Amino acid sequence: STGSATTTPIDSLDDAYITPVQIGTPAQTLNLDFDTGSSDLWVFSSETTASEVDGQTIYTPSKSTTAKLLSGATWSISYGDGSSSSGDVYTDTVSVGGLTVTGQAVESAKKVSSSFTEDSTIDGLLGLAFSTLNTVSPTQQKTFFDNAKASLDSPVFTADLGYHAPGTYNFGFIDTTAYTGSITYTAVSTKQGFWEWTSTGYAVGSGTFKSTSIDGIADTGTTLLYLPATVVSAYWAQVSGAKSSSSVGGYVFPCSATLPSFTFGVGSARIVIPGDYIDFGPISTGSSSCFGGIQSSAGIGINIFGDVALKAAFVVFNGATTPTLGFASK
Numbered sequence: 001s002t003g004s005a006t007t008t009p010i011d012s013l014d015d016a017y018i019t020p021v022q023i024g025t026p027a028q029t030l031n032l033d034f035d036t037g038s039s040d041l042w043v044f045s046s047e048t049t050a051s052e053v054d055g056q057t058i059y060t061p062s063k064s065t066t067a068k069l070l071s072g073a074t075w076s077i078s079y080g081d082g083s084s085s086s087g088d089v090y091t092d093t094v095s096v097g098g099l100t101v102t103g104q105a106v107e108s109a110k111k112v113s114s115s116f117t118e119d120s121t122i123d124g125l126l127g128l129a130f131s132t133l134n135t136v137s138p139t140q141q142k143t144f145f146d147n148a149k150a151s152l153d154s155p156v157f158t159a160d161l162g163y164h165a166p167g168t169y170n171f172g173f174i175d176t177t178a179y180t181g182s183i184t185y186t187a188v189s190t191k192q193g194f195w196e197w198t199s200t201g202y203a204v205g206s207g208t209f210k211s212t213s214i215d216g217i218a219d220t221g222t223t224l225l226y227l228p229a230t231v232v233s234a235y236w237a238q239v240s241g242a243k244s245s246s247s248v249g250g251y252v253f254p255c256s257a258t259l260p261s262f263t264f265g266v267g268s269a270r271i272v273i274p275g276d277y278i279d280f281g282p283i284s285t286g287s288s289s290c291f292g293g294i295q296s297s298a299g300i301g302i303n304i305f306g307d308v309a310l311k312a313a314f315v316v317f318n319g320a321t322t323p324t325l326g327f328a329s330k
Helices: 144-151 229-236
Strands: 003-009 017-023 028-035 041-043 068-078 084-096 099-112 124-127 156-160 167-171 184-187 196-204 210-218 225-227 243-245 250-254 262-266 269-273 279-282 289-292 294-296 303-305 314-318 324-328
Touching: 003 084, 028 041, 041 084, 068 099, 099 144, 184 196, 196 229, 210 225, 229 250, 229 294, 250 294
Parallel strands: 028 124, 041 099, 210 303, 225 294
Antiparallel strands: 003 017, 003 167, 017 028, 017 084, 041 124, 068 084, 084 099, 156 167, 156 314, 184 324, 196 210, 196 262, 225 303, 243 250, 250 289, 262 269, 279 289, 314 324
C-alpha cells in the first residue's frame, strides 16, 4: 500500500504545515501537524476542556463506530517550545492520503497548553519519530508509520515541504519526479528516538564550504533551523545590522536586508536554503526588525534541522531495519 497527502502552510510565514487526516467511522477529518520530532498522535476532542478550544476541529469518539477506549491509558507530553498537552486514549481507524491503519492509538486531549489553544489552524499532532518516544502509559503505543510500515510497498515516508506553498507527505514510495539529481542517504542514530544524523558542514552565501560534523535531528515539527552558535554567528555576520537580541529571543535583522543563502552538507552532497527562506518577518506587527530563520541551538541541547532546512529538500525517512535519511535537491 501507499498514501499521499498534501501538506499546507498554516500562515504566510510557513510557521507550520497541516495535513488532513481521517479518523473514525464515519471519517472525522482533522488537520494535523506531522512531526518527525515526536511520536504521539494526539487531537483536540470532545473531551478537551471547553475553554481551551478556540476554533479547532475536534474528534468526537462517541460518534465513531470504530472507536474503542484504551482502558487505563493516559498520555502527557511537553515539547521543546514549552507547550504541552495530555489526556486519554482511543484506538480507531486512521487514514492519511488513502493509507489506512486500523487500531491506531488516537490520543484525545483533555488539556492543552495555551499555545495550542491560540492556534486555531492545528487540530493536533501526528508524530513520526520513533515509537520509543511515545508517551502513552502504562502501555506505550506505536506511531502511525510504525503501524503502517509492514503493509507499505517500501518502509519509507517522504517529506516535500513547500516554501510559501503546499507540499506533500508520501508513505510507502519514492516519487522520483519530485526531486532533481540523486538522493544522498546518510546514517541515522535512533538512540534518542529521533531521526538523528550528522551533517558534513555548511557554507554561507557564496562562501567556502566548511567541513565540520554537525549532529542534529530532522524535525518537521520545528519551524526554524537551530545550529551551533559559531555557525549561526557566521551566517548573521553577513547581514548588515543583524544582531542577537536577548529581549526578542534570537537573531533579528533589518527587514530591508537581502539575506544570503545557507548550504548544509549531506555526505558529499549540498542542500542550498535560499535566503528568502530565512526571513520570518517583523518581530511584531509593523516593526522594521525581522526575525531570523537560523537561530542558535546553544540553549536546546541538540541541533534541529527544522522546516527552514527541510523545505529546501526532498527528504526520505527510511524506516528499514537500519533506518537512514535521504536528502535531494528539488
